[PDB]
Structure 1
Amino acid sequence: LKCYQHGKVVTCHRDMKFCYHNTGMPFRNLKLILQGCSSSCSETENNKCCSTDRCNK
């Protein structure tokens, strides 16, 4: 599995079967972009995970 990771395509570790994309906004000026290989999403996070190469945006 290969996933996008902030301008790089990285190869996932054998135990990372998913690519992931999510964003966070904890403070008015602060945005977080979580992008990369990952393990399984939460139930709440169901669509933040994808299983195909380079699928994470």
Structure 2
Amino acid sequence: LKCFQHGKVVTCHRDMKFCYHNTGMPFRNLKLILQGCSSSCSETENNKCCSTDRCNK
């Protein structure tokens, strides 16, 4: 999977079956990105787990 881990779409390791988009905690004035790749992601509504390339756009 190649996903936007560093903002740019980068190739995640072969262990990484999922790319995650974590929204963090609802905070205002806080722009922190929690987009990386995961080997075994936990699908929640807080953190979304997609397994398609460039999904975490």
TM-score, normalization by structure 1:
0.69
Gaps of 5+ in 1: none
Greater shift, 30-39 or 6-15, is seen at: 30-39
Measured in 1, the distance between the counterparts of 2:20 and 2:45 equals 10
2:23–2:47 Cα contact (<8 Å) kept: no
Give the structure with the larger strand fraction: 1
2:43–2:49 Cα contact (<8 Å) kept: no
Quote the RMSD (CA, aligned, Å): 2.6
Greater shift, 32-41 or 22-31, is seen at: 22-31
The CA deviation at 1:29 is 5.2
Larger Rg: 1
Change (3 A) 1:3 1:13: same
Match of 2:9 in 1: 9
Gaps of 5+ in 2: none
Paired residues, number: 57
2:21–2:36 Cα contact (<8 Å) kept: yes
Secondary structure class of the residue paired with 1:24: coil
The CA deviation at 1:42 is 2.1
Give the structure with the larger helix fraction: 1
